[PDB]
Structure 1
């Protein structure tokens, strides 16, 4: 069920952080769940601070919006920003003050792989427009794991590389002409990169698209609402066919429609 994005729905709040620690963060579900996890298993990370290690894990979506965690993982090293992703039983996150992506197997609590994203800017070089060290942004779509970033050679333009989920080797790389810092966030649907215009506006838009298949760039004007006017995280879940987002203490989801 692939196609081009033609519509985004109203934001739906599933849960709200009670502490300033959760001002921005990342929540997630596995698009390719494996034992002992299911499609309902939800992970949460409040990413405010310099010592971000705690990952809240919820077996049931019910626990996740109305209860306590079923488990809390302590990451081996501090985590950077809100770009993390869970895929096929592993948490993929960026080590604090680095351009290193770590593959953290959740069930075994083991580090299975680490790789330096070649030439990638980090720690405030090429963040999204709101800052927050969002230089490196992992993504999952119908084809698997990606990483969104930029380099000096790209002059801050969004670069996206297809990643091997086992060893984190770059399989292929595309260079866009979209300034990453000029955009609120980005995600990938069916091999097409999309960007959001603003992180504060209730009247923002999905304003750009870049297709890896054809290399064509396009301007869009699909409405997109930041209900709480501070979206720190915007990701696409290819299983639910939905956008997951974190907006000013609030854990939200958007419905979408594809051509």
Structure 2
């Protein structure tokens, strides 16, 4: 049982102009220092930064995606960007350098017309990677409400199972996944108030503070390589230490 019981004080990395965005780092290995950024909740470009100093100096190169993204729920893993293809129920896996895409359809997912998984961050899909798997958080188009998590096989970009948390998206601000546990924030994105053991398929007790700010939270992501939460909060890129008990 590695379960998170508290979150440390955040560190501010950088202030930027756009209210919504993502910032992403690799977690498959410890040799890649690149940082990727998307701005806004709709677009087709990604900014790539060589390392933290390049990020701090706004020194980026531009990557052109094969399809527009929606939302702020993307993830990077093993030199690939996973993102929601805007206007569809399709997830794109875009491999860097070779700059070519693969796709996965989630047939029973909400995906347009503001039927968001996380309304606060205009997000329909949240891809997450941790110590226990590659995951896609989404909301059911069948009941219109339930948060589901697809567990993927990374090597084949295919779905192994669809897990029903039974938790209604209207109660969720945002979420992240660590050591195989889904942690979901309240609607004001100040506390984690729900958790779900994805491997055992059951709710588990969790309630702990995340932050005091109530500025808009655009992105919230756990990185297993450094065991920090990464966030984008109204243009502030932040890092939070995590404490496991």
Question: In which range does the TM-score fall when normalised by the shorter chain?
Answer: over 0.9
Q: 2:24 aligns with which of 25, 28, 41?
A: 28
Contact residue 20 and residue 121 of structure 2 kept, 8 A: no
Measured after TM superposition, the shift of residue 221 of structure 1 is 2.1
Unaligned runs of 5+ in 1: none
Measured after TM superposition, the shift of residue 195 of structure 1 is 0.4
Aligned pairs for 1:71-90 (under 5 A) are 71-90=61-80
Q: 2:57 aligns with which of 62, 66, 69?
A: 66
The answer on 1:43 being equivalent to 2:36 is: yes
Q: d(CA) in 1 for partners of 2:12 and 2:121?
A: 23
With normalisation by structure 2, the TM-score equals 0.93
Corresponding residue for residue 167 of structure 2: 178
With normalisation by structure 1, the TM-score equals 0.88
Q: d(CA) in 1 for partners of 2:141 and 2:186?
A: 23
Other structure's SS at 2:72 match: coil
The answer on 1:12 being equivalent to 2:14 is: no
Corresponding residue for residue 47 of structure 2: 56
Other structure's SS at 1:83 match: strand
Corresponding residue for residue 223 of structure 1: 209
Q: d(CA) in 1 for partners of 2:56 and 2:188?
A: 24
Aligned length: 244
Instruction: Classify 1:42/1:114 alpha carbon distance in 2 versus 1 (closer, same or farther; 3 Å).
Output: same
Instruction: Classify 1:228/1:182 alpha carbon distance in 2 versus 1 (closer, same or farther; 3 Å).
Output: closer
Instruction: Classify 1:151/1:228 alpha carbon distance in 2 versus 1 (closer, same or farther; 3 Å).
Output: closer
Q: d(CA) in 2 for partners of 1:253 and 1:145?
A: 21
Corresponding residue for residue 151 of structure 1: 140
Tell me how large the CA RMSD over aligned residues is.
Answer: 1.8
Q: d(CA) in 1 for partners of 2:173 and 2:48?
A: 27
Unaligned runs of 5+ in 2: none
